[PDB]
Symmetry: C3
Subunit: 388 residues, 3 copies
Amino acid sequence: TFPGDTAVLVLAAGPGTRMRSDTPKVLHTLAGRSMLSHVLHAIAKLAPQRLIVVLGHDHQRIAPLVGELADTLGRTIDVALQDRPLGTGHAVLCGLSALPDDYAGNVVVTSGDTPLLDADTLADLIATHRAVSAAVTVLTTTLDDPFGYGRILRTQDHEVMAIVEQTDATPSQREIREVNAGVYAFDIAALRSALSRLSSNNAQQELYLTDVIAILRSDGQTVHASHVDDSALVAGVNNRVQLAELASELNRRVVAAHQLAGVTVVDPATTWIDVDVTIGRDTVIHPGTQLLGRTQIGGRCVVGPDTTLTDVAVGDGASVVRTHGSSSSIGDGAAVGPFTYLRPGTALGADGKLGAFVEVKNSTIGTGTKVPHLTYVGDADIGEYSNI
Amino acid sequence: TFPGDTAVLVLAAGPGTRMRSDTPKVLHTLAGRSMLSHVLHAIAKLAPQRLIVVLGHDHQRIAPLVGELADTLGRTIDVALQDRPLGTGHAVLCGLSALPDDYAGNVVVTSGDTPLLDADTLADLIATHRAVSAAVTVLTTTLDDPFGYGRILRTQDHEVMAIVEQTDATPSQREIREVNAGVYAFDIAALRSALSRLSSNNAQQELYLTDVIAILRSDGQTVHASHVDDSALVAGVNNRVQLAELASELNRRVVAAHQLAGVTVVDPATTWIDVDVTIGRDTVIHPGTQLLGRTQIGGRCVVGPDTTLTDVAVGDGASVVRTHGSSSSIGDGAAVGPFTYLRPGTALGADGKLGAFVEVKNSTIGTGTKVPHLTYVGDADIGEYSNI
Amino acid sequence: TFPGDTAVLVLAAGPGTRMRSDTPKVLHTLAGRSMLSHVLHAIAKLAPQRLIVVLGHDHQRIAPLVGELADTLGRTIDVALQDRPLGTGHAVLCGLSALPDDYAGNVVVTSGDTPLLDADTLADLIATHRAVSAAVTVLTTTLDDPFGYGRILRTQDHEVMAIVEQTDATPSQREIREVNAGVYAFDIAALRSALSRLSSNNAQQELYLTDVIAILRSDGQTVHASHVDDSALVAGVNNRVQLAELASELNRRVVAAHQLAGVTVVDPATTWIDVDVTIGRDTVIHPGTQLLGRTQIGGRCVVGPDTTLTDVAVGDGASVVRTHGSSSSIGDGAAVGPFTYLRPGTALGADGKLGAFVEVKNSTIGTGTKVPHLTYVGDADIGEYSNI
Ligand SMILES: CC(=O)N[C@H]1[C@@H](OP(=O)(O)O)O[C@H](CO)[C@@H](O)[C@@H]1O
Ligand SMILES: CC(=O)N[C@H]1[C@@H](OP(=O)(O)O)O[C@H](CO)[C@@H](O)[C@@H]1O
Ligand SMILES: CC(=O)N[C@H]1[C@@H](OP(=O)(O)O)O[C@H](CO)[C@@H](O)[C@@H]1O
């Protein structure tokens, strides 16, 4: 977590055009959270002294949610509005408009569309920054395909010189594969000063935040880039292709953590587990399964195949097979499926049975009660050990 | 599209033994089209002056379909029959039997089993061929595993010498990884001449089309090979293993195009979209979904998970979840699924509901009509805003 | 298969802690067999003169099954019990306690958690061992990630010196990527002698079997390591992450063999086929399908999508779509699904139909009998060509 007097700016003002969506980019959803929700969670964990989200384009619709999140995380989150889209640098300049004019602390600039960004990466950033006592630290990474991203230019001694954006690069600089991750740490005084000197001269007619690296190099200040090996943690999201690739890479990591904690997952590539889901030891998840939202599964269960559960509580030793359910509970040792539909409000007691072609809506089903097949049970209370 | 006086021969005469199937190889199906259908579509788009499909082995069963396709593409397609399987070169010689004896135009020889072959690749071929004013241009590619394919031999100056087939290669030439793609462009006069000189001497006792590259090299004519980086576009299909790998690579590209045009696809690896399918902006497709045939999905929909739709029209803002349907329409704002079965003839109006364990056959269901669960509706007309 | 007087020790005494499971590691299940079942099958095929499984930790629960397997494979399998977990070397020393004190034959030491280990790999091992007339042969492999495994140390002439375990390695030796596979072949006399000299001095305070390679090198005896290119065949299983990766790699190979023998499998990554399953020519398996246990599918069938069948017999030309069934038979030309549930005891004759939302339990359904939708048929006999 964070030394000491630290302020983090989350930049979320972009137009998000390439998503091709009426829903603002950062609100696009991923393993149970919006990209923005992930990024604010990761950041809050470190507990900066300040947390500033720069909203732009769609602030109207994003703002409410930041405050919604601000409460959840029991912490204050500031919102700065960038008026004109006059570039990422201007965005930072807007961010700063929300700290006192003489905040002495370090500044960490990150983005709203890097949902994989984690605690360690961020920490390491400050550790390096303070250690090498840098005026700026920028996180980089090496990609197989560097299109869209800005390129890190280095002389022979591996020393940083400047960052040149996709649009502005020569065709030879496009062959460069080391990219700007868009996560920074700044000496605050050394930042303000550098932003004052940015020109919109070339070539998206804009004020580039990247331009700062070359300015400060010329200033005579110490300019460190820190290479992040695991690109995933630092990858951005501009289109729905990247959104899916990252949804995939995060899922893989969520499943792995469950596997390493005692859950058999027969097919990780087709088992989808949202971030809040809990699962007990020696549970088996068969292929084609989504466990979404607040779903908790106990130990020694069998879930799947083809099972989707949103906000479902599942006891120990239950079996939930080919079921589509939500906002329900399933008791210890209960048997549900195949081809069962649990609508919200279904509470099925321990060792209850819900068989094939059974739909339950808003019903309490007592301990040991069987509903064997082809039945709708809606808005009803059923006693224990009965038979429907 | 095609300069100018151009004739393309599609070779589809092979025995297709390794498919191990009673259905001829090129008729094997892939994202809604037979390999042959893909290849004739790609080719027709460029509009050669002539289009000749060389049929052999199974011509009896393939021919009808070429003429079926010939109509669809509003264009004439010629069929040459190769009698004996006396080699790929003989096949070309058969192809030519369908042009006038003095056709002056260039000849493009491609194959029936390269379903990924696209417009640009083909164009580039002629552009290179005419530019370097070649007697022959052959397309190559580099593979991780070059088994089965023929090897490109090059001296130190990267200059082509000959092509040596899987069977005939030394074991050291098998270490070579650059392969013959089996797509060519020829100077017509320089082709005829070279084929006359082919011998069946070694080692599948046959007349190899590949043999031409070495002959023309000796002739003193200009022999260019053009390396294709994206192997996929140029990969062939000899067994069902390759068929699936290519079905996969094409799917990935179909999904990506949808993603980049505003469709959220949660899991591309398990979402299958045939080539004709249309999908509207901000639709979400959940995992385990096949959209097959002429299926069109509007905007702001939710399809999936576990949904298969063949030739289904789906309005804007409909939800189609765990449904198996075909030859049906689903109205704007309609709710179908989970566990719903739409047989051909189902027409469900705007804001209609078809609930769990409901099967509809050949029925009109009017606007706002609910069928909540566990019901068969067959051969019926139901009024608007009614309740079943 | 095996020369001549050969004895194989299968080591299965580990604590298996990293599985994090109440079920002993080697009993963890994989494509229809426990890891131990796979390994004993592969080994029995070669027909060693002796077969010794060293049980430790959980012998109580594993032993019965070895004898269960011993019968199936019509062959005797010996069980040696290792008392204290005093290391892998001690385990071997325990293994030997079950051969006569003067068994002259070669000894092959393999592990219980390498379920992919095949016939050829094993053969090649002895072929090399006898050919180079080695005192020990160890199988190695190169990994992208060598964590957990023991490292092969080689001087400049590629000659083996010693094997250093994960725990005991310097941080520079951890950069080494060539790993000990834990499959060996020994000259028996040269083994006994070397084990006598093992010390528990460093650093898991234990008797390492690996230590033998360095001892025998010093002895002056001939020490060969044989690199296995296909790591999969030789990969071990310590956690559920590896279990799934291997379940995946084996599946891929099972599907490929079916594809190459005439079965169309649209999506191999999401089609799961246990090892005993048979499938006929020109069958098509659609995505999301599991064929488990003793399931046999005839030719020209259609299975899937979303179909799970455990121990189901399926005739020629049947269609089994969106079905969840087990211990049942489905006749030639029969139509089952979508959303059909076959419980054990279901026998559906040729050209029978079981339609949507139909569950069958323990019933005989005669030739040409239809059960069109939304029906339970339990414990019943139905005549031919009838209608339910
Ligand atoms: C001018 C600027 O700040 N460009 C950054 C920024 O790109 P945008 O395309 O403006 O989002 O973030 C990228 C990381 O996702 C990084 O590659 C790039 O250099
Ligand atoms: C004699 C001949 O023309 N061989 C060609 C041809 O192989 P066949 O195995 O005959 O289909 O097409 C291949 C491309 O799929 C290419 O590798 C090869 O060189
Ligand atoms: C002391 C010893 O025998 N270690 C072996 C053995 O490891 P364990 O972690 O003890 O299972 O098997 C491994 C192969 O899975 C191999 O890498 C290693 O060198």
